[PDB]
Design a protein around this ligand. Sequence first.
Ligand SMILES: Nc1ncnc2c1ncn2[C@@H]1O[C@H](COP(=O)(O)OP(=O)(O)OC[C@@H]2O[C@@H]([n+]3cccc(C(=O)O)c3)[C@H](O)[C@H]2O)[C@@H](O)[C@H]1O
Ligand SMILES: Nc1ncnc2c1ncn2[C@@H]1O[C@H](COP(=O)(O)OP(=O)(O)OC[C@H]2O[C@@H]([n+]3cccc(C(=O)O)c3)[C@H](O)[C@H]2O)[C@@H](O)[C@H]1O
Lengths: 245, 245
Amino acid sequence: SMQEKIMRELHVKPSIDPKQEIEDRVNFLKQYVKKTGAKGFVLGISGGQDSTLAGRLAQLAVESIREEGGDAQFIAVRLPHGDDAQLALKFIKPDKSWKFDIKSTVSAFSDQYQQETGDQLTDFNKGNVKARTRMIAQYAIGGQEGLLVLGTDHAAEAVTGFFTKYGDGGADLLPLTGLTKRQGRTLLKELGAPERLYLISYDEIDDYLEGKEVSAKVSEALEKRYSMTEHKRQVPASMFDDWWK
Amino acid sequence: SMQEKIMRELHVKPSIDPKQEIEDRVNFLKQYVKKTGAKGFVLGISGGQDSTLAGRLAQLAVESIREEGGDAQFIAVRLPHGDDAQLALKFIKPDKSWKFDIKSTVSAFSDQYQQETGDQLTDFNKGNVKARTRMIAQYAIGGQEGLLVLGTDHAAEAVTGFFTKYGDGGADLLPLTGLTKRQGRTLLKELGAPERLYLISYDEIDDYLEGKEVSAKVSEALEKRYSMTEHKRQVPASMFDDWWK
Ligand SMILES: Nc1ncnc2c1ncn2[C@@H]1O[C@H](COP(=O)(O)OP(=O)(O)OC[C@@H]2O[C@@H]([n+]3cccc(C(=O)O)c3)[C@H](O)[C@H]2O)[C@@H](O)[C@H]1O
Ligand SMILES: Nc1ncnc2c1ncn2[C@@H]1O[C@H](COP(=O)(O)OP(=O)(O)OC[C@H]2O[C@@H]([n+]3cccc(C(=O)O)c3)[C@H](O)[C@H]2O)[C@@H](O)[C@H]1O
């Protein structure tokens, strides 16, 4: 069963206890940060469900450590290129709120590309340049502050390879691993998040991930997109690896 | 033995056959391309040993693909920030030779940094932005031209994690994996490279990786640095990973 193997590899459960998932995940963040000796975390907050869930979990993790007598801080940054993000910040309530506007770095790069090359960066290619500029901003803040960069990647986002390689894919740790989009909505409700924040088909993708009976149409499409994106789920390939064969 | 253990995880051979090494690496490049249906490669050339070896190997792979009736090309890019790179291009003889100056993109980033945070990026942190900016440059080109981005990482720098995480460490495939510094120099000599292009120390780092006997001070320093940089050789950390605990 390819569905069983994928389900296994991405760490998806068929059923979850949301309260215990919140606990398990906050504990992972605490634990990783005490192990490494880092000062806390930094995460880009966009207004979307994922970064909202991931940011609230990081504020809870940082607060528990300070309660045990340690030093930890959480920096939430807004990364615009020139309302829900603000709603997300009122809910998360981070220790610090920053902002870094990526419009001038992206422009400078575009102009240079045309100047040097003789071509315009296509929408799709400039789209990835923005995702990668935001990575650099998060790593520059973490670098300056002694913090770890959180990633908002999860299962439904992992099966489809739906993220920019080294853009939002470039992170130090990932608290939402193994969760589906629907399971991620459950946690948010448990956390008492405003509904506006958590509200083939994505719900179809969650069904397959949760081991539910799906249509071969969907199954086959999913299993091919997966093998097609394995490279984004591994470290750069060498002749000593086999997954790409 | 940790010397033995690291040597194996990094794929180093105590003894190599130079000509066979070349053929194996050219064959890896050819084989990856065929499986994925890529059009070719792109790599930043700097004048140093590593980019010079990786680049000469890409060119031979690409010339060999076409002689079999295939479609492939290699673009070598100069990535200045404001003599040997020229000598290198003269030796590699790549299909296409481009250039992208990263100074304006970096100054745009640093300027907005100070403007946003009040503080200025440390020289060290500005240097990691430059490395990450060269990855965006290469990835924009591979995206616009439909090419895979080559990486220069090899065993002599993986042990020390002597690279920028998502900067020069961000690549699609790595043809120099498992080679030590002097071993790479030996490949360049087989290929007939001009001597100026290749002319803890590296000798001690290489002796350790090649399994030669070295002083306790060397093993202690390398094994410590190796442990603290494991995150650079692994996929982002999650609660289902044991390597970090
Ligand atoms: N098989 C192969 N082996 C090794 N490397 C391979 C490769 N195939 C492509 N590549 C490389 O990977 C590339 C394509 O990947 P990438 O640059 O990521 O680009 P791409 O697949 O074009 O996807 C970037 C994006 O992911 C989505 N996105 C981005 C950011 C966030 C979210 C979200 O939902 O949060 C979604 C979206 O559809 C889009 O804007 C290449 O140009 C290439 O150099
Ligand atoms: N334990 C941990 N678990 C998960 N993630 C962790 C972490 N420890 C650090 N990190 C993270 O990774 C970071 C450090 O990695 P990174 O950003 O690469 O930075 P860092 O290791 O300081 O790299 C700067 C450099 O890499 C080297 N480099 C780069 C380019 C060229 C050359 C040259 O000399 O020509 C050398 C060299 O040692 C140096 O100049 C942190 O800011 C943090 O975000």
